[PDB]
């Protein structure tokens, strides 16, 4: 229909502006479908070397990463696919990722057994809380909301208590603990 | 189940010390850690220094027992665990009597780190059991756990001195 363009624009914009954080590889695959959309079917003679301005095709954190090559592989791989469906495979691919429609906060964790803070993406959905790598965007751990028993925000931190689901609270340094808590408190009220 | 029950209990007790440390931090981070009365800063720091030194002296012997002697491992882990209850109590009291909030948090955090490293030592030591036929993956993990505890002891110790100096504790 026409919805598919509105949806495409929205999924696409979220990845470009960083609201939907994705791995480099996926960024590129997305860029591949965006090329198919904006440029039609790939052509090795036109779609060349400095043909793309990467700042309109990748999230800011990946522009200086030298991605043209693999954006072009993902573009080639589309072939004579049409805008309409290229747009749909993008929206499908986005939907396919565990990061899709998660609210994310950049926090800091203390490494277990070490006096060292690491940056970390903490994500909150409907269903779960998840720890995600700042660089790779790997989902390194998830907890169901149903396993969260208590929580507390301060102006400097946020802390979860999973009760007898695991040993140890999970706790992060953040200036956004209140928002994080309101998100989670909302979702858990809703599950009733 | 030779030395293995001692590991389980030891591990459970460290898990418990760590929850007390997270409560103190939570309370602390929101400026509601009431200073503990009935006891001097001197005696708390003395409690903390002692327990740390004894934990430190126990790391290699524990590690070595895990590479060979199942019976001995069971005794060394329970030894190592006994020290953590008093350390945790002392650390929460000391922190509560510390005036500078950053220094109060550093005591708690570094004590947490040490308990965490102890926990990992215990996991890898329990996996090793007495049995020397453990894999080199168990060997490398244990040596790492040991190295991690040693650095934790180093860090907390320094932080102990600094806090001591701020509080005139001698």
Is residue A58 within 8 A of residue A16, CB to CB? The reply is yes
Nearest CA in chain A to B109: A115
Nearest CA in chain B to A154: B30
Report how many domains make up chain B: 1
Q: Experimentally, how was this structure solved?
A: X-ray
Question: What burial letters (b/e) apply to A39-76, b meaning 16+ CB within 10 Å?
Answer: ebebeeeebeeeebebeebbbeebeeeebbebbbebbb
Level-2 CATH architecture, domain A100-192: Roll (2.30)
**Interface list for B 50-89 with A (CB within 8 A):** none
Q: How far apart are CA B115 and CA A179, in angstroms?
A: 31
Of B92, B81, B13, B90, which is closest to residue B44 (Cα–Cα)? B90
Q: How far apart are CA B62 and CA B79, in angstroms?
A: 9
Q: How far apart are CA B86 and CA B122, in angstroms?
A: 18
Which whole-number Å values give the CA distances from A18 to A58, A59, B60, in the listed order? 9, 6, 48
Packing angle between helix A83-95 and helix A24-39, nearest 10 degrees?
Answer: 160
Nearest to A113 among B25, B26, B113 (CB): B113
* Burial bucket for residue A189 (CB in 10 Å: 0-12, 13-18, 19+): exposed
Nearest CA in chain A to B148: A113
B52: domain CATH number is 1.20.1420.10
User: Residue B104's CB: how many other CB atoms inside 10 A?
Assistant: 23
Of B24, B2, B21, which is closest to residue B129 (Cα–Cα)? B2
Q: How far apart are CA A178 and CA B37, in angstroms?
A: 32
Q: Positive or negative CA dihedral for A171, A164, A192, A143?
A: positive
Which whole-number Å values give the CA distances from B121 to A59, A158, B65, B146, in the listed order? 41, 28, 12, 6
Could you tell me which residues come within 8 angstroms of residue A45 by beta carbon, excluding any fewer than 6 positions away? none
First to last CA, chain A: 36
Inter-chain CB pairs, A–B, below 8 Å: 48
Q: How far apart are CA B40 and CA B17, in angstroms?
A: 22
Q: How far apart are CA B122 and CA B74, in angstroms?
A: 11
Residue A19 DSSP one-character state = S
B30 CB neighbours in chain A (<8 A) are 152, 154
- Which helix (H) or strand (E) element contains residue A168? none
Q: Positive or negative CA dihedral for A10, A11, A15, A21?
A: positive
How close B44 comes to chain A (CA, Å)? Answer: 22
Of A6, A161, A156, A179, which is closest to residue A90 (Cα–Cα)? A6
Could you tell me which residues come within 8 angstroms of residue B123 by beta carbon, excluding any fewer than 6 positions away? B11, B145
- Which helix (H) or strand (E) element contains residue A120? strand A117-124
Residues forming CATH 2.30.29.30 domain(s) in chain A: 100-192
CA A2 to chain centre: 25
Residues forming CATH 1.20.80.10 domain(s) in chain A: 1-98
- Documented resolution in Å: 2.0
Phi/psi region, residue A88 (left: phi>0; alpha: psi -120 to 50; beta: rest), is: alpha
Beta strand pairing call for A157-161 and A139-144: unpaired
Give me the domain span that covers residue B72.
1-170
Q: How far apart are CA A69 and CA A152, in angstroms?
A: 46
Of A24, A12, A11, A17, which is closest to residue A133 (Cα–Cα)? A24
Q: How far apart are CA B99 and CA B89, in angstroms?
A: 18
Residue A170 structure tokens = 């999970």
CATH T-level assignment (fold) for domain A1-98: Acyl-CoA Binding Protein (1.20.80)
């Amino acid at each position: 229909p026409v919805q598919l363009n509105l949806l495409y624009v929205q999924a696409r914009d979220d990845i470009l502006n960083g609201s939907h954080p994705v791995s480099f590889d996926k960024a590129c695959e997305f860029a591949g479908f965006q090329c198919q959309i904006q440029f039609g079917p790939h052509n090795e003679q036109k779609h060349k070397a400095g043909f793309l301005d990467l700042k309109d095709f990748l999230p800011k954190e990946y522009v200086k990463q030298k991605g043209e090559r693999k954006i072009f592989q993902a573009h080639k791989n589309c072939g004579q696919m049409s805008e309409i469906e290229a747009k749909v495979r993008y929206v499908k691919l986005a939907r396919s990722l565990k990061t899709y429609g998660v609210s994310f906060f950049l926090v800091k964790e203390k490494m277990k057994g070490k006096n060292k803070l690491v940056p970390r993406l903490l994500g909150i959905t409907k269903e779960c809380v998840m720890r995600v790598d700042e660089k790779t965007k790997e989902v390194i751990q998830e907890w169901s909301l149903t396993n969260i028993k208590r929580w507390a925000a301060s102006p400097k931190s946020f802390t979860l208590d999973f009760g007898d689901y695991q040993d140890g609270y999970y706790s992060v340094q953040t200036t956004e603990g209140e928002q994080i808590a309101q998100l989670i408190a909302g979702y858990i009220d809703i599950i009733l | 189940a030779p030395g293995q029950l001692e590991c389980e209990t030891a591990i459970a007790a460290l898990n418990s010390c760590l929850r007390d440390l997270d409560q103190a931090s939570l309370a602390a981070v929101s400026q509601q850690l009431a200073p503990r009365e009935g006891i001097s800063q001197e005696a708390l720091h003395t409690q903390m220094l002692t327990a740390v030194q004894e934990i430190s002296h126990l790391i290699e012997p524990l590690a070595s027992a895990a590479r060979a002697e199942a019976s001995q491992l069971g005794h060394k882990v329970s030894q190592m665990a006994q020290y953590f209850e008093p350390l945790t109590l002392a650390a929460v009291g000391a922190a509560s009597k510390t005036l500078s909030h950053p220094q109060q948090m550093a005591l708690l955090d570094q004590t947490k780190t040490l308990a965490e490293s102890a926990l990992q030592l215990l996991y890898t030591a329990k996996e090793a059991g007495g049995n020397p036929k453990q894999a080199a993956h168990t060997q490398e993990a244990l040596e790492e756990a040991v190295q991690m505890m040693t650095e934790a002891v180093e860090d907390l110790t320094t932080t102990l001195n600094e806090a001591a100096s701020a509080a005139g504790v001698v």
